[PDB]
Amino acid sequence: HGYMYIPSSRTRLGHEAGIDSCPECAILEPVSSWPDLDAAPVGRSGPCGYNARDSIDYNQPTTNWGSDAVQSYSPGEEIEVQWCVDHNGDHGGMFTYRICQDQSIVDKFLDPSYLPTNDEKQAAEDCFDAGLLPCTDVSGQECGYSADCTEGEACWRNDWFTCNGFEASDRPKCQGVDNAELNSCYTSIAGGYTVTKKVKLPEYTSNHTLISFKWNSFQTGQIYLSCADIAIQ
Ligand SMILES: *[C@@H]1O[C@H](CO)[C@@H](O)[C@H](O)[C@H]1NC(C)=O
Ligand SMILES: [Cu+2]
Ligand SMILES: [Zn+2]
Ligand SMILES: [Zn+2]
Ligand SMILES: [Zn+2]
Ligand SMILES: [Zn+2]
């Protein structure tokens, strides 16, 4: 149970708007999330998430999210990206952030009068994958391999970020990464912990595009997807 926190995602804004009672509850399941991180289709969840708790499809804007960029950044900027894990739903695993570079695909997620089809959602996922923001593109960031993977498996990749070992790495699981305090970010079930990294943006400008967050659970056959509206200017 988790969702993208900084820049503020559609899911964060939906909670803040009184629409989403459980932002951390937006789940793609059941899926094979491990060890082949990109295998499972995204179905209804798409790159922005679907929350079955209150039946919210974040892939299309509403009066409460998706109309405009929440934050503007510069081309090639190394930016802070943060997600929030609930105290009772820290499943370990690996996560990543992506920007789809095809504005024509992105634009299908920016129209309040249009709901993308499941095919469109998968096409977008494939574009996001081609635009993954590698951990190792940030100068000085340490990009480890997962304690829950072995060499050469499909999970053995440090473009993605990893949570700590589900034994610990001292500081087990996702919460161990920042080792932050409880309620450092909002979750509804048991209170949230931050999970904070940097990514390097691409070098083109756009007035309105999307970062999509994807977290592949280790403990469970679940994927957590969110997206944030951003500008690169
Ligand atoms: C954003 O849109 C405004 C108004 O059309 C334009 O002046 C500006 O150049 C655009 N920015 C981009 C394309 O990064
Ligand atoms: Cu969970
Ligand atoms: Zn609140
Ligand atoms: Zn993918
Ligand atoms: Zn694969
Ligand atoms: Zn190093």
Author numbering: 1 to 233
From the article:
LPMOs utilize molecular oxygen along with plant-derived small molecule, proteinaceous or extrinsic electron sources and have been shown to be copper-dependent monooxygenases that oxidize polysaccharides at C1 and/or C4, thereby instigating chain breakage (hence ‘lytic’) in the polysaccharide. Through oxidative chain breakage, LPMOs thus render the substrate more susceptible to hydrolysis by conventional glycoside hydrolases. The AA13 family currently consists of more than 85 members exclusively found in ascomycete genomes and shows sequence features consistent with LPMO activity, such as two invariant but well-separated histidine residues and aromatic residues associated with a putative electron transfer pathway: Y224, W215, W83, F95 and F161 in Ao(AA13).
To provide structural insight into the AA13 fold, the AA13 gene was expressed from A. oryzae, which encodes a protein naturally devoid of a CBM. The structure of this domain (GI:317149073) was solved using the single-wavelength anomalous dispersion method. The refined 1.5 Å Cu-loaded structure of Ao(AA13) has the same overall topology as AA9, AA10 and AA11 LPMOs featuring a conserved central β-sandwich core (Supplementary Discussion). Copper coordination is provided by the terminal NH2 (Cu-N, 2.2 Å) and the π-N of the side chain of the N-terminal histidine (Cu-N, 1.9 Å), which is again observed to be τ-N methylated, similar to other fungal LPMOs expressed in filamentous hosts334. The endogenous coordination sphere is completed by the τ-N of a further histidine side chain (His91, Cu-N 2.0 Å) and a tyrosine (Tyr224, Cu-O 2.5 Å), both of which are invariant across the AA13 sequence family. The copper ion appears to be in the photoreduced copper(I) state, as previously reported for an AA10 member of Bacillus amyloliquefaciens and for an AA10 member of Enterococcus faecalis. In contrast to the flatter binding surfaces seen in AA9–AA11 enzymes, Ao(AA13) displays a shallow groove along the protein surface that leads directly through the copper active site. This depression likely accommodates better the profile of a polysaccharide chain within the more contoured surface of a retrograded starch or possibly a single glucan chain (see Supplementary Discussion), as compared with the flat crystalline surfaces of β-linked polysaccharides with which LPMOs AA9–AA11 interact. The structural elements of the surface groove of Ao(AA13) are derived from the residues in the regions in the long loop preceding β2, the loop between β2 and β3, the long loop preceding β4 and the loop between β5 and β6. The 3D structure of AA13 shows that it shares the same histidine brace active-site structure as previous LPMOs and that the extra conserved histidine, commented on by Vu et al. in their solution phase studies, is not part of the copper’s coordination sphere in the solid state structure described here.
